[PDB]
Design a protein around this ligand. Structure first.
Ligand code: PRO
Ligand code: PRO
Ligand SMILES: [Zn+2]
Ligand SMILES: [Zn+2]
Lengths: 464, 464
């Protein structure tokens, strides 16, 4: 019995694919999950790519405390520790749901003058925002992520940092995850608490719902003032720094799953997939040697190409079982190398996106690289296609209600929080972002009729 | 205030070098510290080296929960969360002090047959073991580490795993940290709670005190039976699995500090140093372009050699500041590139171990690799020498008392926990380990006079 098809019950599909693809399981504590190897592998690949980009932009990792003094922030989202060291604590401690306060506290002492700027930090680690309904990679009390924090002398430098980091997320999304996104500003109601403004990249999942794939905020001098973070400038004048904050959690994995997955299971993007090419040898005692020798040789030839290949040499599972598992886990390509095919110097190259073809083993190494890129380009093409097919401009609240049932709704909004909150209360849909690049338009609020704001149509959609 | 020399007050020297090398700082919560970029970079290299070794030995990373059900274990060590989701928990959760239980729980349901073995897992993350007084990298409530957990079908396979890992640790210490260690067994009184036997690698710091650089435990089937972790063997019979456990925390960093640091600050082992060669460009307005062009050229030449080089062209600090900084931070080699020397195609290459010499930029790329290797060898050499000069066979408790005041004391012990405890109560010294490879000797306990156990002399010392 297969997975509950996407069109049947998308939600139940998602959970099942995660279990079957062995991406994760559920821990003994409600709301907490354990990321199994295969799943962790995806995370590690995302860490690596992001790290490079962070480093190339002059950022450095570090590590701040897990516990934060309540004074700095019981709110529901918080997991609070009231007892430690056997005794009850005078002031309870919050397990970090985010680290801006603690970092700010530390910057207050490290920063003295322009010589201590800019501060370009990043932290890979966990955080805790309490969750009851456990949904691997989408809803979990605890989750892993990357939270970058920076401090600058000028406002201009900070704002450039925000967009720089957002773009890095968009690039990871597009060039590495084959997930098309939309860059823009969150509305006042939707921004990060403490930030003057929040930028974001919004993606559209296969079930028509939007998902924020990453975020970068301009905190101005809000945290600087709160945590007394000032410096003496070259002009001998003492000023407040301007900080920024940017993060991307393993929710990005859920994005990968709900964007490219199908009724057969996962379909991982080549440039982030732990296994780009699995090799399943087909043989009998008589040809075991000659094939494994030809298989391993391929393995080595592929490695030499810099490809992430995996030789499923397991001598205890039918080639079908293997084939199924790798299909379930979304391995881009699969090479079935057997007796008869080998004899002509060829083998069969199965594509996860569908199709097969017997090619010459000697050509595989030179071919695969370019094929993987095609595979990636195709994933993106379809995703784009899907979005185009699920995006609609609306001028009436009746058309809007229809649109947010299928995907993205481009509506005019007055800009009033109460009006936007009403739209969510009635249709459950929210504002995703006020796109940076969008045809400039003026009109009237699709919900209250009053004159539109933002000078362009806002992206609306039901979101995760 | 300069660095309190080691001979004056080693402890104050340590706290001081850590602050001055900007390795870490104290967080807003007691017993908490923040690892600064430079310090974190050290940890990263350690992660990378250990990761490669773990992977080459078939281990895969995963990520289990931060929270552990209290019933799986308020002990002083624990940091308990009693409130979450805006209400008081009916069952207070414990912040993991170690991931033995949860992983066992998971294994209970993941393991069914011998097909599901061996289970070779590793996790990189944080744990919390409440601490009152805070001492960077040695005593902190929260600390980062790597904890390996494996499950095996046979007892032999488990024990081989145990030693395999300890050896990897030992290799890390020796070949990478240039820190000589001693592989042996912890006595019954000093083993890991829940383990059959605990192996370890003991190192001697420059203050004559011992320090555990890492441990590997044979848990037998204690956890397996406790969490009902069994499998159906090939012989159709159902049996318990045998599990191991091994860890190495950022305490290893503290080891690197107290093993090679001098009165001038840190001295980092080349193979683990974030920056192996730093290039500080000294120039004037009329010579900025020429100096920087050559400096960058050298940077690229060294990178090409696979060396970790850094070009310090910060505008927020002067040359004086920098040279002092990199000395404090312990960079193995320093390259002073100025206009005059550049005219003759030269620069000053200074060694952290002491030395200077104007050399032609063209020879540096080809010489440095070798020089670094020598640097490493030298560090190790001295470290070996230091230990030799601070290890002493003792046959009397009086001599014992003297030896433990300088370093290692090779004494005979009855093996009684009571006796061993008495020794510590009296001298504060502890058994570090009963070395695997040591000259076989029979005798009488240095403290109670009763016949000796372990068939060899037991390593004693005052430890961290
Ligand atoms: O939680 C957030 O959205 C910000 C950005 C990463 C760190 N904190
Ligand atoms: O704490 C210990 O010693 C074991 C080994 C690492 C995980 N737990
Ligand atoms: Zn309106
Ligand atoms: Zn005794």
């Amino acid at each position: 019995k297969g997975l509950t098809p996407q069109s049947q019950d998308f939600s139940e599909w998602y959970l099942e694919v995660i279990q079957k693809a062995e991406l994760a399981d559920y821990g003994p504590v409600r709301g907490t999950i354990v990321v199994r190897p295969y799943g962790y592998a995806i995370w590690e690949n995302i860490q690596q790519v992001l790290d490079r980009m962070f480093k190339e932009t002059g950022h450095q990792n570090a590590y701040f405390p897990l516990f934060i003094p309540m004074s700095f922030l019981f709110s529901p989202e918080l997991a609070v520790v009231t007892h430690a060291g056997g005794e009850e604590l005078e002031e309870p401690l919050a397990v970090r749901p985010t680290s801006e306060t603690v970092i700010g506290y530390m910057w207050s002492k490290w920063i003295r003058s322009w010589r201590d700027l800019p501060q370009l930090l990043n932290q890979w680690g966990n955080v805790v925002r309490w969750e009851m309904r456990t949904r691997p990679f989408l809803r979990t009390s605890e989750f892993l992520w990357q939270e970058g924090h920076t401090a600058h002398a000028t406002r201009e430098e900070a704002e450039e940092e925000v967009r720089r980091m957002l773009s890095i997320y968009a690039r990871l999304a597009r060039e590495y995850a084959a997930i098309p996104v939309i860059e823009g500003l969150k509305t006042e109601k939707e921004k990060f608490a403490g930030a003057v403004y929040t930028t974001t990249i919004e993606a559209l999942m296969k079930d028509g719902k939007a998902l924020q794939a990453g975020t970068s905020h301009y905190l101005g001098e809000n945290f600087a003032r709160a945590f007394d973070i000032k410096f003496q400038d070259r002009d001998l004048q003492v000023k407040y720094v301007h900080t920024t904050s940017w993060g991307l959690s393993w929710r990005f994995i859920g994005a990968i799953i709900m964007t490219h997955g199908d009724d057969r299971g996962l379909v991982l993007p080549p440039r982030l997939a732990p296994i780009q090419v699995v090799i399943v040898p087909i043989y009998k005692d008589e040809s075991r040697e000659r094939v494994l020798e030809a298989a391993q040789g391929l393995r080595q030839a592929l490695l030499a190409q810099g490809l992430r290949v995996h030789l499923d040499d397991r001598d205890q599972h039918t080639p079908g079982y293997k084939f199924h598992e790798w299909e379930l886990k979304g391995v881009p390509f699969r090479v079935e190398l057997g007796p008869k095919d080998l004899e002509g110097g060829q083998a069969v190259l199965a594509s996860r996106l569908g199709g097969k073809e017997t090619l010459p083993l000697a050509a595989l190494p030179e071919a695969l690289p370019g094929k993987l890129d095609a595979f990636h380009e195709e994933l993106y093409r379809r995703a784009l296609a899907f979005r185009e097919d699920h995006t609609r401009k609306v001028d009436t609240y009746e058309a809007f209600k229809e649109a947010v049932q299928e995907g993205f709704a481009l509506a005019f909004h007055c800009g009033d929080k109460a009006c936007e909150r009403l739209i969510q209360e009635e249709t459950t849909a929210t504002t995703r972002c006020v796109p940076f690049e969008a045809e400039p338009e003026e009109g009237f609020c699709v919900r209250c009729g009053r004159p539109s704001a933002y000078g362009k149509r806002v992206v609306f959609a039901k979101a995760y």
